[PDB]
Amino acid sequence: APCEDLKERLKKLGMSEECRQRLEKMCKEGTSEDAERMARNCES
């Protein structure tokens, strides 16, 4: 699945609205591993 696991974790971990909107955007065009890494840098 494209970015379902990653983007649903942005929702499940309950980061900022802006945080999700940054990360799922980068996960589409860019590498998913770098997007979730920025999710870990965003919150944890």
Side-chain angles (χ1 to χ4, degrees):
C3 187
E4 294 304 288
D5 179 83
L6 188 157
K7 169 266 302 177
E8 291 302 301
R9 291 178 191 254
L10 311 182
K11 298 168 56 182
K12 197 283 179 180
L13 297 173
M15 57 187 49
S16 303
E17 305 283 284
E18 176 182 66
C19 186
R20 316 181 300 198
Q21 288 174 87
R22 282 172 174 170
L23 295 173
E24 60 92 80
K25 187 277 182 181
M26 297 206 64
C27 185
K28 293 163 185 174
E29 56 174 64
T31 54
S32 55
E33 294 185 85
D34 282 77
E36 56 142 278
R37 253 56 174 181
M38 298 300 97
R40 302 177 195 289
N41 286 280
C42 185
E43 293 298 284
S44 51

